[PDB]
């Protein structure tokens, strides 16, 4: 039957990467894109990418007056800062991919529904009161009554699969997460006033290690309810343009033999071909650039310390392309979500 | 009595200017205006990723409506439109305009309307106002100049060098290429650029980025004898600060034009404040924080004989686009104060 | 029967060449020699920081004395001296010399002594052997030439562009500046450089570093009509790969020399494999992994009339110093194989 | 009396930074420098530094044929890869600062003593059989009978003060350390064969997050005997040229009130003006470049989780300039060690 109609709000890093994957989807049709700039700018950003490859080498991208044309397919372009002004209704838009970073609450995203959209997927955490989905961990909780959902954050899609497998193997008592994270667009190019008042994100991104807060651990309860309230964590932003790593320091309680090898073997048993991969090579961050795993466990860094009485302090580490890993996960979730539309 | 000075735009240039003006006995920094709160401004002043840790030698404390630096209290305003600033009631003499949003005489007039007596713009600002490179043309300044430009970083590097070369062997024409540190007008990662520049939209720290520059084309404002003789462009590269200017000039002379005679002339033209002379194998991080507006690099001079008195010449000089420019702008401001 | 090929030096160029030769039906990679063990060599082939994850599409496994790629077994040697290699008995036809330590006909002769029939050096290597830029002068090759040079990355960028300019409007003289990615001959942090270069001793990733280059001086080897007309130098900047060449030439012509007529000439000389033509606003990361030896950037062309048929002209082209060079060298090797 | 005669073996990052500090110490005299290069190369590296500032702006440095002259004072230069060939004895060298990275054992460093030097301070870990010193943590165990000592590693000088204060406040059961570390000279500029066979240090330093092993946590027992065997850890090398941070994830046992505030207040009580500083501003790595603290506790990053029954999992974080923080600690140790000559 008819392909599901998809609009993208915000043609940024995530939006353009989701475009690369949705545009090839036979079961979908990208009808419109909205941003804050003209078609030639959007076409050039789509064509050339500093970290994720030269898209123009395999595709023809051409800008029109009010549209872009990719491989013959014409997509209309809008420039509306307020979603209420978007014509989602006349375009019969089924799903809005909300990737602006400016509609991150169920109340804000509701504007898309008011404009005539049927469903909205927010490409970020967007509160404690909406469905937060990590594909292949809890995407099956989605129902027809969910109109606005969150695809969580890049760190949550990396932490969740790993935390779940560990917890299933040896119950987690508590854990502290540290993510060593590529710099992103919400940091400054050089020291300058940050619009949100964050004094550390105001510092030059490419020449600093920058401590930053993250809510990925504290909000793990939305994705893995048995871990609700057990994890806290934070981030260090460092000078790589993409590619990140999550380190979890957990206290686990178990009667089993808890060793580096038994830990690694459980992680390997929990791996799957789409979301959670298993690695034993000495890779570094540039090797995971562009991968489609949401999370890649690194068996080479597993550490274990026996505290006695069935208690252990354990370190498990996994890699993620904060751009493309998240995007591939968000896209899988979108493809599943579409069943509730058509 | 000390001259009352306000800073509009507490950015890279405004904060570096502050470091130097704050110590000037002949001036008093009365106010700062930007688009953020006092705590943000105090933190940016205390810690700098490329120009050093200012909090190590100074006390900076944020208040509700001010900052206090070394005991001295400075008022802080948050007005995007200069007409709303109380320059008149603060009896401000000179406004340092460092926002990048008032770069024309008509736009800068707002500061004077608000009650200031003089404005110095920290950028090129049209062809119709005094454009000043200290120790090249600052003496054209008169009492009737209310709004002036301190030109650009690249112009403050090129002018001393081009002038000295031209005085030695007249330039027929020249092409400038500047290898330039990335700046705040480029994006941290690939994204939509607000002014529609497709190259500036690219990630700053992992790309060589060609970009346009008007420094060579507008050199006539500073060195009238070179008017219309130079063109040029830029390459932005991944260093946070520190830049180099390469001039490829065809010169005509009956003299002996060699790498040595060229270098000896550059040295003869050097002076202790603006235009320095280097013969060491330095690299860009070595000039970070220097106070020369321009540092000629004798190690890179090249000369080719075209015959019949014509030569093609490459001369190179270094500049800290942040602090070299600032030191020049501050010299100009101190001179400008005589008219207040 | 397929041509038997050995690689000496499994570095940036050696591994990138492997990537292109391994799929060639007319070739068979028989051996690899370096200064490390098979596991080290296998990991480097698998994962590359700037040229992509090779392990995503290929199977690479290290053995005790070999590596196996996609089922094919390749012997590995660890011999610092080329005389100790068993080239003769493995019946190696062509040796790809990519170590950087055999950069002369006399040194490269060792490979022939060890029993190989032909040697291609991945660098400039003297005046006493053929220096080849594919699609510029590769056709001078004969069967009686046993050792050839594939020139330098910069030469492979400069030559096609200089040739096209010169054919259009003869060059009187020129000065070249290349803005170049840092490479393995620079230090990771400031430290003693073994070859005594005071600038290559400085940290590669946080500096603009002037350095000398012989590409312009030796253009005569590839384009004899330009012999002695060009000089040049380089600026190493903090990108791991991707470079650009700027040529500032004085040209003499009776024709209409404009940015447009220059660009149109370049487009006319472009071709599908070696010399490409660009009019998009690209930056250096866009040309990573490209297979052109040279990509002319029409957006940066500049021209100044000096009067009397003289013009000063700026033409610019891009090149991936690693893979652009490699693609040219692989084209040269494949042509060279006809003589085997 | 006579100034202590000091020789520097290895004019690298640490040797040159140490020179800057020692050269001004009146109680010392830098008599010789040995490396693998000529005076011209050494003089330029001392004048200009990509991360630690332009030294020539404040000093005159001039190269001769076999010497350098800094502010008028002439210093002899040697090029001897084997320490046995150095004329330490005839120059009456008291202390050798061993900063090459090639004499990191009591047995290798003994070569300097054989050459006629009286004492050696190695700028790295160098075994379990010699004194390993973190200033203001255990430097007072030094005796006149100690001829060869280790100044430990940069990470150890950051970890030791923090772990000690934590342990003194609430005893550590076990801990895992992660250090986010500036790239260093033992990584490659671009992907290439690493001489020591480390497949990760073989990768380009400035464009990768690179996992690496470290023995700092594992060997903390040499400096803090009560923590022996309780800590393990590793590192992530990232693309900043200098400036590092250490994260310690410790399980502690206590009957006291263990909170982020009680932890931070304990850390502050343990701070001192020279070695262990206390921070509450939102700094990032470039702010600590060139600082002289060996360790700078970051109170803004403290985390605590209650496990019940007196157990807590805690995160404490400290900053350090892996180059100049370590050098400053090593120089304080050298100045103290001089009492025994
Ligand atoms: N980049 C990452 O690593 C990453 C990973 C996971 C989730 N996210 C989340 O995805 C969202 C976007 O991330 P990003 O890195 O792509 O940022 P981005 O800056 O690259 O993209 C934002 C885009 O949205 C447009 N935009 C902004 N406000 C708008 C409005 N009111 N109306 C229409 N368009 C608007 C901007 O022009 C820009 O093109 C954020 O919520 C971010 O937190 C980012
Ligand atoms: N950074 C350099 O290398 C350099 C060198 C020479 C000249 N300049 C010029 O100096 C000016 C400032 O440059 P910068 O590098 O410091 O940029 P910047 O982004 O670091 O600083 C600009 C500051 O002005 C403030 N601002 C912006 N709009 C404003 C408004 N309407 N009202 C009040 N404040 C406002 C911003 O908050 C910011 O703090 C620009 O015109 C620039 O071209 C810069
Ligand atoms: N990297 C570039 O941008 C580039 C471009 C064009 C041409 N080249 C030239 O290609 C050559 C190799 O360059 P590279 O970038 O690959 O350097 P590289 O350091 O990455 O690789 C050189 C390889 O040769 C090996 N080697 C060194 N000495 C040896 C010996 N005695 N015997 C056997 N093997 C030895 C090394 O182990 C290393 O693997 C150089 O001459 C260089 O100038 C380099
Ligand atoms: N750089 C740091 O962050 C750091 C921090 C703490 C401890 N260290 C330790 O200090 C030591 C030196 O470190 P670095 O950063 O200065 O490295 P470096 O490469 O910058 O310095 C090494 C110097 O020693 C010289 N050298 C090498 N072998 C020699 C020999 N046989 N004889 C004489 N001179 C020789 C080299 O020419 C070079 O100048 C190492 O043990 C290192 O682990 C380094």
Residue numbers in the entry:
A (entry chain C): 15 to 356
B (entry chain D), C (entry chain B): 16 to 355
D (entry chain A): 15 to 355
Please share excerpts from the published article on this structure.
Atopobium vaginae is a Gram-positive anaerobic bacterium of the Coriobacteriaceae family that is held responsible for about 80% of diagnosed cases of bacterial vaginosis (BV) in humans, a condition that can lead to obstetric complications and gynecological disorders. One such virulence factor is the glycolytic enzyme D-glyceraldehyde-3-phosphate dehydrogenase (GAPDH, E.C. 1.2.1.12). Binding assays with recombinant C5a and cell migration inhibition assays by surface-immobilized AvGAPDH of granulocytes challenged with zymosan-activated serum (where native C5a is produced) have confirmed that AvGAPDH could functionally act as a virulence factor, a feature that might contribute to the infectivity and survival of A. vaginae.
The determination of the crystal structure of AvGAPDH to 2.19-Å resolution provides a detailed description of the overall structure of this enzyme as well as a high-quality view into the active site. AvGAPDH is characterized by an N-terminal NAD+-binding domain (residues 1−167) and a C-terminal catalytic domain (residues 168−356; Harris and Waters, 1976). The catalytically active nucleophile Cys168 and the activating His195 lie at the beginning of helix α5 and the end of the following strand, βI, respectively. The crystal structure of AvGAPDH presents the closed conformation of the enzyme. NAD+ molecules are tightly bound in an elongated cleft in all four protomers of the homotetrameric AvGAPDH structure. In the AvGAPDH structure there is no residual electron density at the Pi, “new Pi,” or Ps sites, indicating that they were completely unoccupied in the crystal. Despite the overall conservation of the peculiar S loop sequence in AvGAPDH, there are several substitutions plus a Gly211 insertion at Ile203-Arg217 in the middle of the S loop.
